[PDB]
Homo-oligomer: A and B are copies of this chain.
Amino acid sequence: AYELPELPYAYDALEPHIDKETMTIHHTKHHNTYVTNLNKAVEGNTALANKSVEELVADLDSVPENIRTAVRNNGGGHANHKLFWTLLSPNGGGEPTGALAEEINSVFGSFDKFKEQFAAAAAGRFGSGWAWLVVNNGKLEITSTPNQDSPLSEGKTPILGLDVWEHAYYLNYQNRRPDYISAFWNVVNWDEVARLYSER
């Protein structure tokens, strides 16, 4: 009984970094489709349905082989986008602070180095996928996954993610993925990332 979450802001609140039309289609069509298909996949499996989408994707091995693909793709779609909306803000941007900033400077050397490495991962993901900042064994690291696969399935907790499926940027940037990635930094809600960091 999963549901499509409402956005924390207006559809045009992230302009011009992300266009109103993309936000509208991305949320009401793409994300919504993952929710619809996810509910159809777990229909009848009270056990799986009672778990949060994150818990569900965290253990795909416990999902029946007959619907494992559907849960992987659609569960991943729902988990990834639900997190993604909460990481954006019309009042975001800037740089991390507190414990998160300290960890970033210690692991990557500096926030600028982190952005360079994160941008490289996002640009290097061939095909559809996501670029991530996760906590693995209590350590921060950058990774990328294909399609709707989530780091949660490998025991890693994402605290920042960038959707690099073409639907996330084609209307305003077309083939210019690097320009989309650069614009991303202007809307990142580092306060939310910091909260997820503490929880991870």
Which residues of A are interface residues toward B (Cβ below 8 A)? Answer: 25, 29-30, 33, 73, 126-129, 146-148, 165-167, 170-171, 174-175
Contacts and interface: CB of A to CB of B under 8 A. Distances in A.
B174 A29 contact: yes
21 contacts: A25-B174, A25-B175, A29-B174, A33-B175, A73-B126, A127-B127, A127-B128, A127-B129, A127-B146, A127-B148, A128-B128, A165-B166, A166-B166, A166-B167, A166-B170, A167-B170, A167-B175, A170-B170, A170-B171, A171-B171, A171-B174
User: How many copies of this chain are found per oligomer?
Assistant: 2
A21 to B, nearest CB: 8
Contacts of A25: 174-175
Contacts of A148: 126-127
Contact of A30 (B30, B127, B165, B175): B175
